[PDB]
Amino acid sequence: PRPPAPLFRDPIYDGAADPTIIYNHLEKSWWILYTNRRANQKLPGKAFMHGTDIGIAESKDGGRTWFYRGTIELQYGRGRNTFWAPEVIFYEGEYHMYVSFVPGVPQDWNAERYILYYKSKNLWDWEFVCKLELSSNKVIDACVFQMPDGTFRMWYKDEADHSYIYAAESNNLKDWKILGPALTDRPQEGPNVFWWKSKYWMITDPWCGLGVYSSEDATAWHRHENILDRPGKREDDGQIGHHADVLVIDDETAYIFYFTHPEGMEGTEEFWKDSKYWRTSLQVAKLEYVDGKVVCDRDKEFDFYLPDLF
Ligand SMILES: [Ca+2]
Ligand SMILES: [Mg+2]
């Protein structure tokens, strides 16, 4: 059947955003990990975006039904801090998380941002490995893809360099070498790289729907039309899509997980003055390949199924 719409709302703060989907091999279930903004609280300034943990949504029926399981509450030093937009990959029997960190609970954008590396055997329990040394101390929104020579490539947003997408590389998943700016066409965030239809694709969030790029080498990018830039008809899908994660099932089947601010009015003073605008909803849509380009009709019915990985 068609996926649920919305796919999922967080039942603690209703601030589900920046979804990353990961198969839980031990419990044989699909997990979505998400930034949980404190969206249903009456808070000063931009506080609702901060003091965040990672929420867990689980499906045992291939994504037809989702249930909140709880939080991943990470620690980096002392106090109440901010955790954003985890990347999680399974590799050599372990889960590898690249999570964005903001010190304390800011009420504005006047703070550093780091990417931190945590590891887990079971997706519940995480051990701190290290802080990544990237191009600045204002870096967020890691995504990782393993290249054919075995080297892992990372993309992230550098807010200290015009909010451009940067690339880095690692052979051991711990130590990362800066490759430099990957995209210098526009400020954007939430990079997501995948392989499909014999090409590399990057999805970005330039805040007017999602950017779409293709590459033969995951270095030289060719820009295509945005997706999820027009309102959808489904419940809570009537606004631009944000910060996506792509799951490739097979050569014909790829799903895009994203979030909306369903009440809209982003980019206005009204957004910050009325907490009704703060809530976010997870969504899924099906990617298509038309005239050599990845496209998406968020309104088109499809039979959503997330099979167990064997
Ligand atoms: Ca991401
Ligand atoms: Mg992913």
Numbering used by the authors: 2 to 311
Paper passage:
Crystallization and structural analysis of the apo form of one of the Caldicellulosiruptor enzymes, Ch_Gaf159A, enabled the elucidation of the first 3D structure of a GH159 member. However, Ch_Gaf159A is substantially smaller than its homologues, consisting of only a five-bladed β-propeller domain. Each blade is composed of four mainly antiparallel beta-strands. The stable monomeric state of Ch_Gaf159A was confirmed by means of polymerization-induced self-assembly (PISA) calculations and size-exclusion chromatography. The fold of Ch_Gaf159A displays striking similarities to that of glycoside hydrolase family 43. The positions of E190, D142, and D19 in Ch_Gaf159A exactly matched E186, proposed to be the nucleophilic catalytic base, D127, and D14 in XynB. E190 in Ch_Gaf159A is suggested as being catalytically important given its proximity to the glycosidic O and its description as a catalytic base in XynB. The surface representation showed two electro negative pockets, one of them capable of incorporating the X2 ligand. This substrate pocket structurally explains why Ch_Gaf159A acts as an exo-arabinofuranosidase, or -galactofuranosidase. The complete loss of activity of the Ch_Gaf159A mutants D19A, D142A and E190A, which was tested with pNPA, AXOS and arabinogalactan, confirmed this prediction.
Functional, biochemical, and preliminary structural properties are reported for three glycoside hydrolases of the recently described glycoside hydrolase (GH) family 159. Even though the thermophilic enzymes investigated—Cs_Gaf159A, Ch_Gaf159A, and Ck_Gaf159A—cleaved pNP-α-l-arabinofuranoside, they were only weakly active on arabinogalactan, and they did not cleave arabinose from arabinan, arabinoxylan, or gum arabic. However, the enzymes were able to hydrolyze the α-1,3-linkage in different arabinoxylan-derived oligosaccharides (AXOS) with arabinosylated xylose at the non-reducing end (A3X, A2,3XX), suggesting their role in the intracellular hydrolysis of oligosaccharides. Like some other glycoside hydrolases, Cs_Gaf159A, Ch_Gaf159A, and Ck_Gaf159A are activated by divalent metal ions.
